[PDB]
From a paper:
In this article we describe the crystal structure of TarS, an enzyme responsible for the glycosylation of wall teichoic acid polymers of the S. aureus cell wall, a process that has been shown to be specifically responsible for methicillin resistance in MRSA. TarS possesses a catalytic domain with a canonical GTA fold (one of two distinct A/B folds characteristic of nucleotide-sugar dependent glycosyltransferases) consisting of two closely associated α/β/α sandwich Rossmann motifs that abut and form a continuous central β-sheet. TarS possesses a D(91)XDD motif with aspartates coordinating a metal cation, a feature that is typical of the GTA superfamily. Altogether, TarS features a novel architecture with closely-associated trimerization domains connected by a linker region to three protruding catalytic domains that face away from each other.
Limited (thermolysin) proteolysis of the purified full-length TarS protein resulted in crystals diffracting to ~ 2.3 Å resolution, with SAD phasing using an iodide derivative revealing cleavage of the N-terminal region of the catalytic domain (1–216) and the structure of the TarS217-573 as described. TarS1-349, described above, was isolated by designing a structure-guided truncation mutant (based on the TarS217-573 structure) that resulted in a structure at 2.3 Å resolution with intact UDP-GlcNAc bound in the active site. The intact (rather than hydrolyzed) UDP-GlcNAc in the active site was achieved by soaking crystals in increased concentrations of substrate (50 mM) before freezing. Brief soaking of the TarS1-349 crystals with UDP-GlcNAc resulted in an enzyme-donor complex with UDP-GlcNAc trapped in the active site as evidenced by the ligand mFo-dFc simulated annealing omit electron density. Our analysis of the enzymatic mechanism of TarS was facilitated by the capture of various TarS1-349 structures encapsulating the catalytic domain in complex with metal and substrates. These include the native structure with bound Mn2+ (free enzyme), the UDP-GlcNAc bound structure in the presence and absence of Mn2+ (the binary Michaelis complex), and the UDP bound structure with Mn2+ (product complex). The first loop, designated as the catalytic site (CS) loop, contains the putative base catalyst D178 and moves towards the catalytic center in the presence of the intact UDP-GlcNAc donor substrate. The second loop, designated as the substrate access (SA) loop, is ordered only in the presence of UDP-GlcNAc and sterically occludes an otherwise open channel leading into the active site in the absence of the intact donor. Structural analysis revealed that Mn2+ is coordinated in a hexahedral manner, via a bivalent interaction with both side chain carboxylate oxygens of D93, the UDP-GlcNAc/UDP diphosphates O1A and O1B, as well as two ordered water molecules.
Residue numbers in the entry: 1 to 349
Amino acid sequence: MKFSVIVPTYNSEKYITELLNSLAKQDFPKTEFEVVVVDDCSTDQTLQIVEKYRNKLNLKVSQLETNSGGPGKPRNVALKQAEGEFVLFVDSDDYINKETLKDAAAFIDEHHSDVLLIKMKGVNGRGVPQSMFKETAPEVTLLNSRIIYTLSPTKIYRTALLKDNDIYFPEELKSAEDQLFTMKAYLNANRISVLSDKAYYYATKREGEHMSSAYVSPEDFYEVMRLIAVEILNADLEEAHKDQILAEFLNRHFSFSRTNGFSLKVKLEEQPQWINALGDFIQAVPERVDALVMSKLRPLLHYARAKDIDNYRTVEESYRQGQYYRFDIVDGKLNIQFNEGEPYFEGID
Ligand SMILES: CC(=O)N[C@H]1[C@@H](OP(=O)(O)OP(=O)(O)OC[C@H]2O[C@@H](n3ccc(=O)[nH]c3=O)[C@H](O)[C@@H]2O)O[C@H](CO)[C@@H](O)[C@@H]1O
Ligand SMILES: [Mn+2]
């Protein structure tokens, strides 16, 4: 067994066939890959739709007692059932290219990848990461490539890599359940590879609610962030490398996560809740890492670590308004003091 395609379902009857047709049309022998379907207690006709593909595909189907509250637990149940050499997570509302398992198998046989990224394509207006999919690369690291800018589970992982290092998704969590999982796989992979010859994984936009839009409390969200920083800092790598990996994670988190602009969008009466959870995550980042981060984020790291929402919000409002209490211009960049009696933050551009 080469691959295990792990499919978590939850009331997926309107789009599960578009998936199952792409596996049935794979030009890969159905005897060397399995479809591990774990249903998160669906109440529509998802399972009988799946049943019609029991002679078109090698299937392993099971259903949970109650809905787990997220994609994590179903994938965890499928992953310990998987006996394929490699694992591919495909969501119920997505589908893969006809040639995916053939090109992957051929690529991994040639380069012995532990994690293999496959190029993605957005369908029906859904955005998709692309900065790391412009060239097929046999070997990429966390620091010479943009792989940290895609933490979704929609990749090829070697089964032994996940099991030998005890890598699973957090359970009862609507979103952010993928970031810690994929980063742990990145942290332990002896070789990470990118495969961009075609458009392999098709991420769709349908209706209704996608899990990436479901509510996750700031406590649960930033606990995952805190766990990622802890995983980075205690990886079996050189200490300077771990600091730089953490800095690159923070650059991306503060630029593109819900943290970016929270004190401008969240209701005032809820922002202490955010600054306390965000601060528990930044308090796990040692202050030495602030120097490796993008300069504009250093005042935010500083006031997050101190749980100071007033100065944090003033920094965000100042960036948005382009107005500062005091600033100097040195070497085409700004050195800013955001409030009276506060420190100056230098090199901001
Ligand atoms: C970035 C990307 O390309 N895909 C991610 C995106 O998918 P997305 O935002 O589309 O969320 P989805 O609804 O597709 O959920 C992902 C998968 O989990 C299953 N599911 C959903 C709810 C539930 O209670 N039990 C269950 O098993 C879905 O059927 C689906 O197969 O946001 C999710 C939340 O982090 C991630 O898991 C997906 O990997
Ligand atoms: Mn989806």
